[PDB]
Structures are given as C-alpha cells and as structure tokens.
Design a protein around this ligand. Structure first.
Ligand SMILES: Cc1cc2nc3c(=O)[nH]c(=O)nc-3n(C[C@H](O)[C@H](O)[C@H](O)COP(=O)(O)OP(=O)(O)OC[C@H]3O[C@@H](n4cnc5c(N)ncnc54)[C@H](O)[C@@H]3O)c2cc1C
Ligand SMILES: NC(=O)c1ccc[n+]([C@@H]2O[C@H](COP(=O)([O-])OP(=O)(O)OC[C@H]3O[C@@H](n4cnc5c(N)ncnc54)[C@H](OP(=O)(O)O)[C@@H]3O)[C@@H](O)[C@H]2O)c1
Ligand SMILES: CC(C)=CCc1ccc2c(C/C=N\O)c[nH]c2c1
Length: 426
C-alpha cells in the first residue's frame, strides 16, 4: 500500500529494510525468480552482466550490509554464488520476503494528477495488473541494457561466428577449443579473457584506449581498504598519484611492456581496471593484446594494425546503458543526458519518486545505498523534508557544473560521486 519498491537487488532490499524498520507499508516487485539482483543470474544460467567467474572486486567488510555481516568463512572476494546466497539470507533475516512479489515485472509507472502512482506489473503468466501506490522507490539498476559499439565493424552481418556481449557470456566452458576476441579493457573484459584463457584454444583482447590496470591488492591491502586508510587520506591528490604511480611500477611495471596501450591521463584521471590476472595471462601467451577491430573477413577478424585471425566468436564487453523502460517519460535524465536527481536520489519535479542506486562510487556502494534508504524512508513518512524544487535544481546544477569540471564532459559521469563526503551528508 504505502510504497512500491521496484526491484529486490542489493538496493531494494536495503530499501525494504529501511521502510520496515520504520513501519512503512511497502511491497518489492522483482521480475526474477528470487532476490539478489545481478548476483543471482550467474548461477541459474541467466543472461546478465556477470558470469560463472564473477567474484567481488571489493572487500567483504565493506560490501556486506553493516548490520548483516557476511559469513566468517567467506573470503575477501566471495563469488557470485556466495553473494547471491548472503542476499537471500539477508531478506530472510530482515523479514522482507513477505513483501516481495517475485517474477513480477514492472511494465509501467505513472503519476496521476493527485500524487499516488499507478504501477502496472507483469505476473509470470504475462497477465498484466495495475495498482496504485502513494510512493514509489526505483531500485532497478543501471546495468540492464548492453552497450554495443554503434558503428558495428563492417562485415559483421557476414561473419561466420558468434558476436556477443558480456550479458550473454556465461561460461568459459562453452568456448572450449575455439578462437575468441574479447572487446574491452574494463573489469568485464579482463575477467572474460582470463576465463577464455583456460578454455578457448586462443583468446585475443581487442583494446582501443588503454586503462591503468591495477592489481586488487597493494601492500596486501585492497584498493577499497586503502581508500579508507587514515594514512591514504590526509594525503593530497598528488601525494596519492605518485604513491600509486610509484606503487604500480613496482608491482607490474609499465603497461607498454605488456603490449597494452598506455593511458593518456594518469591514474585517477583515467578509469582503472582492477585485475590480479590479465598481465600474467599475457606474459604466458594465454591472451594476446590487439588493437581495435576494423572488419570481419568471414571466418576471421581484422584489426587496425592490419593483423588477421580466425575467430569463432567475439564477446563485446563494451558496457551497459542505463534504461528505465517502466518510466514512460524522461528517466531521471534531462537534456545532455545529465541525470537530474537531488543528492543523486530525488527528482525535482516529481513528488513521490526516489531513485536508489543510480550512484557510482569509487568502491563498493553498499554503504551508499544504505544511507539513501534511511533518508528516503524519512522523506516517505514525513520525518524528513526536501527544499523547494527551485532550490533542489541548484544542488543539481552545482553537481553537474562541477561534474563537467573534474571529470569533464563524458558519459555516466553524472551519477558519479565521492564516497566519504557524500556519506557524511547522511
Ligand atoms: C558485472 C558487475 C559486477 C559488479 N561487481 C561489483 C563488485 O564486485 N562490487 C561492488 O561493490 N559492486 C559491484 N558491481 C556494482 C553493482 O551495481 C552492485 O554490486 C549491485 O548490483 C547494485 O545492486 P542494485 O540492486 O542497485 O542493482 P541490480 O543488482 O541490477 O538489481 C536490480 C534489480 O532490479 C530488478 N528489476 C529491474 N527492472 C525491473 C522491473 N521492471 N520489474 C521488476 N524488477 C526489476 C532486477 O531484476 C534486478 O534484480 C558490479 C556490477 C556489475 C554489472
Ligand atoms: N567484480 C568485478 O570484477 C566486476 C566485473 C565486471 C564488471 N564490474 C563492474 O560492472 C560495471 C560494468 O563495466 P564493464 O567492465 O562492463 O565495462 P565499462 O567500465 O563500461 O567499460 C567497457 C569497456 O569497453 C570499452 N569500450 C566501450 N565502448 C567501446 C567501443 N565502441 N569499442 C570498443 N571498446 C569499447 C571501454 O573502453 P573505452 O571506454 O575507453 O572505450 C572499456 O574498456 C563497472 O562498473 C565495473 O566496475 C565489476
Ligand atoms: C588505490 C587505488 C588505485 C584506487 C583507484 C581506483 C580507481 C577507480 C576504480 C574503480 C572504477 C570506478 N567505477 O567504475 C573501481 N575501483 C577503483 C579504484
């Protein structure tokens, strides 16, 4: 009755546990057969971002719910299987399952001209239903639509192999004995190559830009756990750069010495891809660096260096677009694409709407989703209020005029935040 929480991922669950702790009527509507978000799919063979080799890249003490510690015996980087099971367990322990409608897909969402919202949802039967809720929390994720290169390399309609995205990648095993080109230098690409390196007769990694490649642990301590060190803080933004710069040459040297394109801008001023394996897998010829693809010569792929290779398949780890198909109207976004959400959560013009999770921290988000849930719960019952809409558009336009100034015009930069200062305001 009171709140429709869209989705039962890490974010809905956190949200459904903040509303219950305050006594608010609410339901969570998930489209999948269980809760867990993306973490549940690798494991039921379902098409999602993850893959049979997906483990955390952040620490457990910092990625689990602060009030629901992850099992003792779990490692620093548990696997998709262990996380999905911790999440199911959290919903069990926080009483949220009585509230979750599974296999119920939200087809649509909309404001009526009095403030409650009609929410249409699709039952497994495909049979549709419309209901009405006073408030709606969107917790749908921003990794739902794959981002294929728009000009797809010519000749791809006449390739004799399988062109695919990391959403459809599942097991390194399905590619046994075959020849594949992973496209990307992100955490999905470095991971799929490393898998394909132990299953496919050959694995090539097509890169086009070059990203600082960091190992998961420096000095024994994970990159998230150092960003929380008091010693790492209390260090200026150049004391750190050089620290790391000095730090990564001693740990992996230079990347031009691995056949990888050097990045144009230094660490922190260019994305980092975390990986403890992709440099070794190269130094062992399990994966071979390539430039970008230029065409598909039936049975083979051509690169911008002139090189050719027989290639049964090509898995494009090119990333994801954020869509909200159930918001028949502007997604939080307006104009250049800038997402317009106050404190990264509140639509300025739409009362009754909240967005939990749209943020990309440098690190694990769990603590960021938890804050948003608590504040959203206080906004929903009236224990918290927002500024007027004109003043909310000042915080947004400040965050944006600033985002184009430390990150510069680029993509998805407008959901990007600093963990510490942002979670201080909660
Ligand atoms: C491949 C990958 C690996 C990652 N690894 C890490 C990591 O190691 N550490 C880390 O800190 N972060 C990681 N992240 C970041 C990631 O965003 C979070 O781990 C986490 O998934 C956020 O959960 P969420 O609930 O916001 O979104 P999701 O996990 O995407 O779940 C959102 C849920 O909304 C549901 N939903 C969406 N639309 C509808 C609809 N119309 N009707 C009903 N239900 C709907 C979906 O079923 C989904 O289960 C990773 C992200 C990806 C893509
Ligand atoms: N736990 C883990 O280890 C793990 C695993 C997977 C994913 N993740 C997370 O999930 C999210 C998904 O990111 P992702 O790894 O899928 O990738 P991403 O960060 O979205 O970047 C995609 C990669 O593809 C490249 N690319 C983009 N467009 C391209 C094009 N047209 N042609 C060729 N290459 C292109 C990008 O290089 P350019 O951008 O320079 O073009 C980049 O290297 C991230 O937030 C990531 O941290 C984490
Ligand atoms: C100690 C160091 C080098 C910290 C740097 C650092 C930079 C970027 C990322 C990302 C990418 C963010 N969103 O995709 C995830 N973890 C990161 C860590």
């Amino acid at each position: 009755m009171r709140v429709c929480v869209i989705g039962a991922g890490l974010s809905g669950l956190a949200v459904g546990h903040a509303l219950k702790e305050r006594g608010i009527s609410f339901v969570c509507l998930e489209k999948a057969p269980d809760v867990g978000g993306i973490w549940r799919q690798p494991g039921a063979g379902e098409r999602g971002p993850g893959y049979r080799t997906l483990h955390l890249n952040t620490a457990k003490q910092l990625t689990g719910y602060a009030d629901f510690p992850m099992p003792d015996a779990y490692p620093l980087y548990p696997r998709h299987s262990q996380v999905a099971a911790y999440l199911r367990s959290f919903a069990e322990w926080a009483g949220l399952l009585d509230h979750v409608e599974l296999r119920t897909e939200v087809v649509s969402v909309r404001q009526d001209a009095d403030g409650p919202w009609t929410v249409v949802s699709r039952g497994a039967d495909g049979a549709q239903v419309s209901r009405r809720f006073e408030q709606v929390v969107v917790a749908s994720g921003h990794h739902n639509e794959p981002a294929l290169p728009d000009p797809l390399p010519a000749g791809a309609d006449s390739f004799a192999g399988t062109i695919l995205h990391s959403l459809d990648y599942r097991d390194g095993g399905d590619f046994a004995g075959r020849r594949v080109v992973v496209v990307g230098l992100g955490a999905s690409a470095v991971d799929i190559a490393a898998d394909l390196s132990r299953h496919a007769e050959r694995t090539l990694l097509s890169v086009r830009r070059g990203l600082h490649i960091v190992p998961k642990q420096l000095f024994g301590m994970s990159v998230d756990e150092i960003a929380e060190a008091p010693w790492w803080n209390e260090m200026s933004f150049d004391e750190r750069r050089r620290w790391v710069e000095q730090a990564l040459l001693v740990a992996r040297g230079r990347l031009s010495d691995y056949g990888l394109p050097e990045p144009d801008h230094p660490v922190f001023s260019s994305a980092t891809t975390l990986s403890d394996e992709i440099l070794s897998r190269i130094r062992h010829g399990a994966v071979t660096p390539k430039p970008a693809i230029a065409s598909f010569d039936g049975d083979r792929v051509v690169f911008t260096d002139g090189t050719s290779e027989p290639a049964d398949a090509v898995v494009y780890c090119t990333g994801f677009h954020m869509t909200f198909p159930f918001l028949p109207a502007g997604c939080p976004m307006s104009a250049d694409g800038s997402v317009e959400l106050y404190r990264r959560v509140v639509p300025a013009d739409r009362p009754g709407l909240y967005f939990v999770g749209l943020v990309r921290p440098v690190g694990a988000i769990t603590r960021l989703v938890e804050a948003q849930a608590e504040w959203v719960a206080r906004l929903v019952d009236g224990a918290a209020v927002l500024p007027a809409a004109d003043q909310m558009r000042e915080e947004i336009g400040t965050y944006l005029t600033g985002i184009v100034q430390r990150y510069g015009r680029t993509e998805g930069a407008s959901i990007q935040v600093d963990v510490g200062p942002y979670l201080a305001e909660f």
